[PDB]
Amino acid sequence: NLAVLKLSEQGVLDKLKNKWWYDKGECGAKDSGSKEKTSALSLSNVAGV
C-alpha cells in the first residue's frame, strides 16, 4: 500500500507504461500516420466523368 504510491508519485509507472507500450510502435499507422505523398492520378479516380 505504501509502495505502489511511491511508484505513482515518481512516475515509474509512466516510464514502464511508455517502455512497454509506446517505445514498441511497430505496425503501420502510428509511425507512418504523419508522412506525406504528393500524388499520381490514375484512371480509377476519374471514371464517372
Binding site: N1, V4, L7, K17
Partner: protein
C-alpha cells in the same frame, strides 16, 4: 471464479484464497465479489470494457 454450490474459487483466486500462493502481481481486476476473500492495494492502472 467461484464454483456454483460449493464456492470453489479456481484459477488465480483460489491460489490466494486456499493458502497456495503468497502474492499475485498480475492483471487482476478489483470487483465486488473478490474483496470478501482476498485484499487489494490501491489501483495502479485504469481501464474499461
Amino acid at each position: 471464479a467461484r464454483d456454483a454450490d460449493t464456492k470453489i474459487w479456481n484459477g488465480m483466486v483460489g491460489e490466494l484464497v486456499y493458502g497456495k500462493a503468497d502474492i499475485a502481481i498480475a492483471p487482476l481486476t478489483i470487483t465486488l465479489v473478490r474483496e470478501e476473500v482476498i485484499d487489494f492495494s490501491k489501483p495502479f492502472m485504469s481501464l474499461g470494457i
